[PDB]
Design a protein around this nucleic acid. Structure first.
Ligand code: CL
Ligand code: CL
Ligand code: CL
Ligand code: CL
Ligand code: MN
Ligand code: MN
Ligand code: MN
Ligand code: MN
Ligand code: MN
Ligand code: MN
Ligand code: MN
Ligand code: MN
Ligand code: MN
Ligand code: MN
Ligand code: MN
Ligand code: MN
Ligand code: MN
Ligand code: MN
Ligand code: MN
Ligand code: MN
Ligand code: MN
Ligand code: MN
Ligand code: MN
Lengths: 103, 96, 86, 95, 96, 78, 105, 92
DNA sequence: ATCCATATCCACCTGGTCCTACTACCAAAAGTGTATTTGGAAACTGCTCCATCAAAAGGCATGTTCAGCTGGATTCCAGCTGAACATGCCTTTTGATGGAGCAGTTTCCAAATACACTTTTGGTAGTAGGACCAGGTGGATATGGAT
DNA sequence: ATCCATATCCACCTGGTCCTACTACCAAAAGTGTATTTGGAAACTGCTCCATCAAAAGGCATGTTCAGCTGGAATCCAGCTGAACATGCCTTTTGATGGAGCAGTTTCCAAATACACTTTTGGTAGTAGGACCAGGTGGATATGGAT
C-alpha cells in the first residue's frame, strides 16, 4: 500500500518526499508536506491538461501538442500570470492584431 | 552498461490526463513541457517554504509552510483551489 | 583537422527572417533600419545567454554544450524555457 | 498588382500568428551560435538540442520584443516600427 | 509673474532630484496602508519601520514609473505625461 | 484614504522622476497604480505575518514581501 | 591561535561565513576553501562600494557616508548599478538628470 | 542576540577611507548588501553543485557562481581576490 | 543694451542629533586536537551522438522596379495646465502612558530520524501495430478591389 | 452593383511518423517495524514599542483666477517601404562514417565530518565626550525675462 492512494492521489507522495529532502530546503521534512505538495502539483497539472485538452478539441485534434498548452495557459488569466516568465517551446503566440492596423 | 535511470513525472501526468480527457493523447514534446512545468512549480513552492522556515527560525518544512507558500506563489483562484486540495489530501492521509 | 573561419554570420539572420518574426509579433510595416537594429539586439541576447551556458559547461569540465546548460543559463537570465529538460 | 500595400502584411500576420514553426533558418542560426560561442571559449561542441533551445529562446524573445516595439510605434501615432521604438521598449524593460 | 510657464517646473525637478526626503505626507500614507491591510486580516498593527519601508518602496516605484512614463510622452513628441504613457509603460514593464 | 495623496505629492514624485508637465488625468491614474502596488506588497507582507502567528506587521515582513516581488529593499534589515 | 581570516589576510569573518554556509542548506557539505573565497569576494565588493561612496561624500563636503552617497556611488558605476539594478536604497534619491527635451529654449 | 557585518564594514572603511565615517542607516544598507550578495552567490553555488550531482560546495563552485553573478570587471577582480585568499590560506 | 524682482549661493554660527570610544560580562562562537567516514578525483573504457562529408532538389533569399500611402513638416487655435496668492486645515511633533503582544525561557511528547529487512515499482528495452497528422492534388466559394 | 483574380477552404486520402500497448528484467525506490532522538508547541511572562489621546504652530494643501503655450487637428508632399517578379544559391534532407568525449564503473585517499575540550570574540549595555550637520541669518550676485 502506497501513501499516494492513502492520500487519494495519483501523483507520487514518496518521490515528492525524497526529492524534497534531496534539495536541502530545511533540516527536516514533516510527513504532511509531501502529501500537500503532491496534491497541489497534481491539481495544477489537472488544470492545465484540462484547458489544453479543450484546446486540442477546439482545433479538432486527438492529442495535445505544445501549441495547445500555449493557448491553454495564455488564454487563462491566472495560468498566464503563473507562467508569465516562461517560454513554451513551439508554442507560438496568440492571434492578436492591434485594432489600428485593421482595414 | 546500467544507464542512468532518469526519473520523470510522465506516467503521473498521463494518469491525470486520462482522468480529465480519456480520449486525448499527448505528444512527447508536450509531455516534456508538462514535466518541466511540474519540476518548476515544485522548485518554486519548496523554495518559498524553505525561505519561510528560515525566516521563522524553524528547521522543519511542515504542510503549513507548503500551504502559505502556495498562497504566496499562486494567483487568486488557483491558490484557493490548490490550498483546498492540499488540505483535503492531508486530512485523508492523516485519516488512515 | 582544419576548420574554416566563422565571420559575419549575423548576416545569416536574413531580412526575411526578421520580417517573419515581426509578423508573428503583429507588426504591419517595418522601417529599413530595423533589420540591423534587430541583429544588434539579437547579438547581445545570444552573447549573454551563451556566456552563462558555456560557464556551466566549463564548470562541468565538459567540452560539449548541453541543452541543460542552455536551460540553466536561460532560467538564470529570467527567461525560463520548457521543452528541453529540467 | 491586386492587393494594396499592407493587406498582404496582415495576411502574413494572421499566418505566422497561427503557427509555431521557427522562422530563422536553422543552419545560419547554428553558425551564429558557434561564432558567438567560439569567441568565449575555443573547441566547444553543441548538442543539437542545445542549438534548438537557443533558437526557441531567441525567437520567443524577439517576437515579444516586436510586440512591445509595435505598441511603442502605435503610441507615437505611427504604424511603422523604427529603431527608436525597439530602443524605447528595451529601455522601459530595463534591458 | 516674472517666469514663463514651465521654468519653475524645472526648478522643482532640480530641487527634488537633489534631495532624498519622502514626498508623500507620512500619516495619510500610514492611513492608506492601514486601510488596505484591514481587508486581508483585521485587528492588525504595524511597526513604524514597516510603514516607513512601505513608503520608501512605494515612492521609489512611483519615481521610476514616472521616469519611464516621461520617456513614453517624449516618444510621442509631447512634454506632458498622460495616462496613456503610464499604461504603455506598465504594459512594457510586464506589470500588465 | 487613497485620496490622501494630495496632488502636490504626486507632482513632487513626478518631479523627482524628471517630468515637466502633468496632465489633469494623471493624478487618479497614479492613485490606482499606487493602490495595486500597495495591495500586492501588503498582501504578501501580512501573509508572512500570518505564517508567524503574529498580529504585528514587522519591517522584516515588508522586506520579504518586497524581495519576492522583485523589488528588494535595503535599509530595514535582511 | 590566529583567526582563519588572518590566514587568508582578510578583514571579513571566515568562521562566520563558513557557519552561515553551514546552515543555509546550500549543500550537505562545504569545503574549507569556499568560506574564505566567499568572504574575500564580499570584502572586495564592500571595499569597492565604500570607496566610491567615500568619494561621493567628499564631493559634497561631508565627513560621514549617508545613504545618498551610496546611491550616487552605485548609480554612477555601470558595474555596481548593473549588480544592484533591482535594488532600492532607502533615502537614496535619484541621479540628477533632466531629459534633454524640455530644457531651456 | 543579532549578528551583523557592521564592524567588518567599518574595518574596511577605515582601511579605504581613514577619515570617513558612516551613518547608521548607511551601515544598515551595507549589511543588507552583504547579506544579499551572500545569498545570491551561495544559492548560485548550491544550484551549481546540484546540477553536477555533487554534495560539496568548494571554492570552485563559489568562483563559477561569482562569474555568473558579477558583471565583468567586478567578476574578474573578485575572482582574483578570492583565489588569492584561498592560496594564501592554504599556504599556512 | 537696461533694469527689476526673485532665486541662488557662500560664510559663519549654534543647538542637538549621532557618532565613536572605553569599561565590563559572557554565552556563543571559533579554534584546536583526535578519530572515523566518505565524496569524488584518477584511470579505464563502452558507446552515444556529434562533426563532417557528399549529393541533389527546390524552397526561399536576393536584387530590382514601381507606385501607394505614410511619416514628418508646417500652420493654427482652444483650452488645458502652470503660476501665483489668500486662507486656513491639517500634519507634525512630542509627550505621557496603558497595555497588547513580541519574544525569552522551560517543560516534554508527538513526531521526525536512523537503521535494517521486505516488497513494489518505475524505467529501460524491444517488438508489434495502429491512429493520426502533414502535405499533395483538386475543385467550391469567398473577398478585396478595379470598375 | 458587376465582376475579375487570387487567396481561402473543405473534403478527402496516403505515406510515414510517433504513440499506446504487450511481455519481461530488475536495481533502486518505497514500505515497514523497530528503537532512539528532539523541534518546537504550549504555557508563563518581562520588557518593547505600538496605539491613542492632547496641544500648539505653521508648513503646505486647497481652491481660484488668469494667461501662455502645448496638444492635437488639418493639409501637403517627398520618398520610404510594400508588393510582385525573375533568377539561382545554399539551405534542407538522407545517409554514412570516424572518433571525440560523455558517461559508467572500480580503486583509493585526501579532505570532510564528528566530538569533546579550550580560548577568543563579537556584541550588549551603560556611560563620557565631541564634531558634524541641519537650519537660520546676512548680504553678495547671478538669472530670467519684461522693458
Ligand atoms: Cl507536516
Ligand atoms: Cl528611429
Ligand atoms: Cl491618456
Ligand atoms: Cl573547498
Ligand atoms: Mn475518516
Ligand atoms: Mn571569431
Ligand atoms: Mn554646540
Ligand atoms: Mn564513495
Ligand atoms: Mn499620416
Ligand atoms: Mn487662447
Ligand atoms: Mn498580555
Ligand atoms: Mn510497473
Ligand atoms: Mn490531424
Ligand atoms: Mn492539412
Ligand atoms: Mn497507412
Ligand atoms: Mn529541544
Ligand atoms: Mn506643438
Ligand atoms: Mn509622389
Ligand atoms: Mn576517447
Ligand atoms: Mn572584543
Ligand atoms: Mn545647510
Ligand atoms: Mn538673507
Ligand atoms: Mn538676463
Amino acid at each position: 500500500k502506497t501513501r499516494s492512494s492513502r492520500a487519494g492521489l495519483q501523483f507520487p507522495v514518496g518521490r515528492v518526499h525524497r526529492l524534497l529532502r534531496k534539495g536541502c530546503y530545511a533540516e527536516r521534512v514533516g510527513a504532511g508536506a509531501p502529501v500537500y505538495l503532491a496534491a497541489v502539483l497534481e491539481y495544477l497539472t489537472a488544470e492545465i491538461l484540462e484547458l489544453a485538452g479543450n484546446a486540442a478539441r477546439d482545433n479538432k485534434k486527438t492529442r495535445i501538442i505544445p501549441r495547445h498548452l500555449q493557448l491553454a495557459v495564455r488564454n487563462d488569466e491566472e495560468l498566464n500570470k503563473l507562467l508569465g516568465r516562461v517560454t513554451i517551446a513551439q508554442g507560438g503566440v496568440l492571434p492578436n492584431i492591434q485594432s489600428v492596423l485593421l482595414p | 552498461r546500467r544507464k542512468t535511470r532518469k526519473e520523470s513525472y510522465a506516467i503521473y501526468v498521463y494518469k491525470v490526463l486520462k482522468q480529465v480527457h480519456p480520449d486525448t493523447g499527448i505528444s512527447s514534446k508536450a509531455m516534456s513541457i508538462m514535466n518541466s512545468f511540474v519540476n518548476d512549480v515544485f522548485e518554486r513552492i519548496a523554495g518559498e517554504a524553505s525561505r519561510l522556515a528560515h525566516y521563522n527560525k524553524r528547521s522543519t518544512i511542515t504542510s503549513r509552510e507548503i500551504q502559505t507558500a502556495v498562497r504566496l506563489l499562486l494567483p487568486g483562484e488557483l491558490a484557493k483551489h490548490a490550498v483546498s486540495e492540499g488540505t483535503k489530501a492531508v486530512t485523508k492521509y492523516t485519516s488512515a | 583537422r582544419h576548420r574554416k573561419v566563422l565571420r559575419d554570420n549575423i548576416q545569416g539572420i536574413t531580412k526575411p527572417a526578421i520580417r517573419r518574426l515581426a509578423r508573428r509579433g503583429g507588426v504591419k510595416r517595418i522601417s529599413g533600419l530595423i533589420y540591423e537594429e534587430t541583429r544588434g539586439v539579437l547579438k547581445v541576447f545570444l552573447e549573454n545567454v551563451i556566456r552563462d551556458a558555456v560557464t556551466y559547461t566549463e564548470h562541468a569540465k565538459r567540452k560539449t554544450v548541453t541543452a541543460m546548460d542552455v536551460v540553466y543559463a536561460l532560467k538564470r537570465q529570467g527567461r525560463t524555457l520548457y521543452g528541453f529538460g529540467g | 498588382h491586386c492587393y494594396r500595400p499592407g493587406t498582404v502584411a496582415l495576411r502574413e500576420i494572421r499566418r505566422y500568428q497561427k503557427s509555431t514553426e521557427l522562422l530563422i533558418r536553422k543552419l545560419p542560426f547554428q553558425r551564429l551560435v558557434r561564432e558567438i560561442a567560439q569567441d568565449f571559449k575555443t573547441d566547444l561542441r553543441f548538442q543539437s538540442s542545445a542549438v534548438m533551445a537557443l533558437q526557441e529562446a531567441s525567437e520567443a524573445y524577439l517576437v515579444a520584443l516586436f510586440e512591445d516595439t509595435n505598441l511603442a510605434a502605435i503610441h507615437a501615432k505611427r504604424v511603422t516600427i523604427m529603431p527608436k521604438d525597439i530602443q524605447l521598449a528595451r529601455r522601459i524593460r530595463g534591458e
